[PDB]
Amino acid sequence: AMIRKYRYGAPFDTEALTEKIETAEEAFPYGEISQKEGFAFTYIMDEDDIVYGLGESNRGINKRGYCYISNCTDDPIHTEDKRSLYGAHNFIIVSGKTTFGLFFDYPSKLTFDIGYTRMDTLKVSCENADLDIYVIEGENAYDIVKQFRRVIGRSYIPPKFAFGFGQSRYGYTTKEDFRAVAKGYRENHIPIDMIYMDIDYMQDFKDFTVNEKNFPDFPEFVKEMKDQELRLIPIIDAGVKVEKGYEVYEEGVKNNYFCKREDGSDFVAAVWPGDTHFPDMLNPEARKWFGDKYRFLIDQGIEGFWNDMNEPAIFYSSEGLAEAKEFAGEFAKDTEGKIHPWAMQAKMKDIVNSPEDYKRFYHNVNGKKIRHDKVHNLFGYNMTRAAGEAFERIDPEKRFLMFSRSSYIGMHRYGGIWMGDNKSWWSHILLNLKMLPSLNMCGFMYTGADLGGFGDDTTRDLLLRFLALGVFTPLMRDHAAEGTREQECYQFENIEDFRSVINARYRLVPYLYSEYMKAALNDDMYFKPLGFVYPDDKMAIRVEDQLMLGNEIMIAPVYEQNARGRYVYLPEEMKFIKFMPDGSISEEVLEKGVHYVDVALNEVPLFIRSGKCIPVAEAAECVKDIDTENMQLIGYEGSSYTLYEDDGIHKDYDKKENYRVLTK
Ligand SMILES: OCC(CO)N[C@H]1C[C@](O)(CO)[C@@H](O)[C@H](O)[C@H]1O
C-alpha cells in the first residue's frame, strides 16, 4: 500500500525485489517524466530538501551537489570528481517538506544529476525507457527506508567469526608468508580471526585451483591455521583463464557457459591470468556451474570467500590490443611529428575498461542474446548470487563469509561488499564513514573499507585512526596494495597501541554482533544518519561525520591528521566513553549541544545514549574465546539492553533462547 510501481517499456527483470508489486495505472506522482531523449525524470527540490541514498557512491551522505552515475567501474582512484565506482545502488530519498522514496530498477548506465547542473534540480536519466520505478511513501526518510528494505528481502548474514578482525595483503604467497602473519599477530597478543588470500594462492591465477608448489597439502595448512582460530579467506576472480587442459575452461567452452561475441565465439578479456573468458552470470545453468565450483575450496575447510574484478574488469580485449599495437606501429615510424606522445598515452589508457568492449559480448538468457552493456550493472551481483545459491546447496545449515566488489541491489541477500581500492589518505576515513548508512539503506550491512588504506604508503597514525573506525564496521580488515609500505600491525613501533584498539573491537563484538542480527532479522538499519533518529532537530539532520549505531550508541571517529580530538554535536545527553590503552573504560556525562572531545591516537571513542546501556566483554584474542557470560554493563542506571546471541555458525534465527534481557 505504501509502494507503487511504474513501468516504462520492456524492462529486464533484475530480480532486485522479492515482493511482487502490481503495476500502477495513474500518472507518475512526482515531478515530470520524459521519453524524448531516452528517459528522464525531473524534479524541482525545495531548498531545505536533503537527498539520501545511492549506497556505494562518492561524496557525502546528503547527495545534493554533484553527479552520480550507476555504471560499475574498476577505478583505483577515489577522488571527489569521480562519478562512478564499483556499485550501482539506484535507491534515493528526497527528504524535506515533501518526502518520498524512489528506486530505479534499471540494470544499465543511470545518471543522477542531483543539483549539479542547477542546484534546485534533481534529474535522473538513462539511454532507454526500459525500466521499473518504485515510488515509496511515508512520514519520514527512516519510515521509507524500512518499507524498502522489506521488499528487497532480508540482508545477508555472516558467520560470527567474520566480526573478528582480518589481515590481508596483495602479496602473501607462501606458507612462510602466512605463518609470519599468524606469528606477528598471536605472539604479540593482538586479536585476529582472519587472514585473506589474494590471487597469488592460485595456480597461475586460475579460479578454483591452488598453487601446487606452495601448498602441496592445502587442507592440512588450512587446519594448521584454523586450530589457531585463523580462517583463510581466498579470493575468486570473474575471469576464467584460457588454457588447454584447465578443467574450468574446458567445461565452460564445451557447454557454452561463457559470454560470447555476436558471432558465437567466446569473448576474450585480459586480466591477471592473461586471456580469460567470463562465465555467463545471467544464464541460470551457467550460474549453477560456476557457483558449484566453490565446493573445491569448501571441501578443504575454507569457510569464506571474496569475489573480485567482477564489474567485470577488463585490462584489454583482443580487439583493443590489436588496435593499440597498430597505433603503436604508426607512432613508432612517424618521422614527421604528426603522432604525439599524448595520443599514444591516450590510446593505451583507452583500451582499459573500455565501454566499447562492454558492447562486444552478450548474455544468453533462456536462449535470448542480450548485449552486455544493456545489463552491465548486474554482473558482479549474479556472480555473488551464483556463489550464495551454491552454498545453500552445498551446506544449507551453515553461514559462509562472502563479500564482493561490484554489486547491484538484490545482491545484498547473498553477500556483503568491501569499498574497493581506497587510498592511505586521511580523507578516505571520512569516505568510509559516510558510505555506511547509505549502504545500509540499500540492504548492504556487512561492509567496510581497506583499513590503513589500500593504495599508497600509510603511516602509523593513519592506520590507528582507520582501525578505530573499523572497530564499528562489520567488515574490519587491514588490506594493502602491492609494493606498498607494510601495513601489518606488527610493522610499527609501540605495538601495544594496536593491541589496545583491536581489543576495543573484541570487547564490543557481542554488542556489535547483537545489533547486526537484530537489524538484519527485522529489516532495520545497523548504522543510521543522525537525522533518522532525531528528525525534529534541524542541527542533527545535517551532521555528516557522526553516525548512530542500533539504538544505543553514536560514533564519532577522528579523521584529521595530528588531531588530539574533534568537535561533536550531541542531540541529547550522552555518556562519552573511551576504551583506554591501559584496559580501563573512561566515562563522562556530556549534555545536549556542541562539544570538543579529546581522543588520543590509542583511544577508541563512542557515546552512550540517555536511557540506554551496552554490554562489554573482557578482551579476548579471537571470537570463539570471548566471554559472554557475566559481561560488564556501561551506560545509564535503570536502563536495559536486549542481547541477541546464537551459536554464530548455523541459521537458527527464531528461538526465544537467542534473546537475553540485561539490566544495569
Ligand atoms: O582494481 C584492480 C586492482 C588494482 O590494484 N585491485 C584489485 C585486485 C587486487 O589488487 C589483487 O587481487 C586486490 O588486492 C584488490 O583488493 C582488488 O581490488
Placement of cell 556483503 in the chain = 416
**Identity (one letter) of the amino acid at 445?**
M
Cβ contacts of residue 352 below 8 Å, gap of 6+? Answer: 314, 315, 316
> Which of 223, 214, 229 is CA-nearest to residue 299?
223
Pairing of strands 166-167, 194-197: parallel
Strand 416-418 to 401-404 pairing? parallel
Q: Which three cell numbers stand for residue 135?
A: 515510488
Q: How far is CA 313 from CA 75, 89, 92, 239, 477, in A?
A: 10, 18, 27, 9, 23
Experimental method: X-ray
Sign of CA dihedral 283, 236, 410, 50: negative
Phi, psi (rounded to 5 degrees) for 633 = -115, 120
Q: Is 581 within 8 Å of 497 (Cβ atoms)? A: yes
Find the helix or strand (DSSP H, E) in which 311 lies. none
Listed in sequence order, the residues at least 6 apart from 366 whose beta carbon sits closer than 8 Å to its beta carbon are: none
Residue 237 CB–ligand 1 contact under 6 Å: no
Q: Is 311 in the pocket of ligand 1 (CB under 6 A)?
A: no
Q: Three-class SS of residue 329? A: helix
CA dist 174 and 161 (Å) reads 24
Give the cell for residue 97: 517538506
Q: Is 478's C-beta closer than 6 angstroms to any atom of ligand 1?
A: no
Structural domains of the chain, with CATH: 1-154 (2.60.40.1760), 155-537 (3.20.20.80), 538-664 (2.60.40.4040)
Of 473, 386, 368, 371, nearest in space to 422 by CA = 473
* Ligand 1, pocket-test mutation among 72, 235, 309, most atoms within 8 A of CB: 309
Write the single-letter amino acid at 551: N
Determine contact, residues 547/438, Cβ cutoff 8 Å: no
Give residue 567's identity as a one-letter amino acid code: Y
Residue nearest to atom 9 of ligand 1 (CA): 170
69 three-state secondary structure: strand
Q: Does residue 524's CB lie within 6 angstroms of at least one atom of ligand 1?
A: no
Distances (CA, A) of 639 to 317, 420, 613, 634: 61, 40, 6, 10
Computed from CA positions of residues 352, 358, 359, 363, in that sequence, does the dihedral angle turn out positive or negative?
positive
Ligand 1 midpoint to CA 141 (Å): 35
| DSSP three-state, residue 246 | coil
Contact 609, 533 (CB under 8 A): no
522: left (phi over 0), alpha (psi -120 to 50) or beta: alpha
Distance from C-alpha of 167 to C-alpha of 17, rounded to nearest angstrom: 34
Residue with cell 549474479: 382
DSSP codes joined into one string, 270-329? EETTEEEE-B-TTSHHHHHHHHHTTHHHHTTT--EEEEESTTT--SEEHHHHHHHHHHHH
Pairing verdict, β 91-95 and 50-53: antiparallel
Return the amino acid letter for 325.
K
- As a dihedral over the C-alpha atoms of residue 162, residue 164, residue 165, residue 166, rounded to 10 degrees, the angle is -30
CA 443 to chain centre: 11
∠ CA(515), CA(519), CA(525), 5° rounding? Answer: 105
Burial of residue 396 (CB within 10 Å: 0-12, 13-18, 19+) is exposed
Burial class of residue 595, CB neighbours in 10 A (0-12, 13-18, 19+): middle
CB 523 less than 6 A from any atom of ligand 1: no
The answer to whether the CB of 273 is under 6 A from ligand 1 is: no
Distances (CA, A) of 608 to 194, 251, 588: 29, 56, 10
End-to-end CA distance of the chain: 41
Residue nearest to atom 1 of ligand 1 (CA): 74
Instruction: Provide the greatest CA pair distance for the chain.
Output: 85
Ligand 1 proximity of 199 Cβ (cutoff 6 Å): yes
Q: Resolution of the experimental model in angstroms, please?
A: 2.1
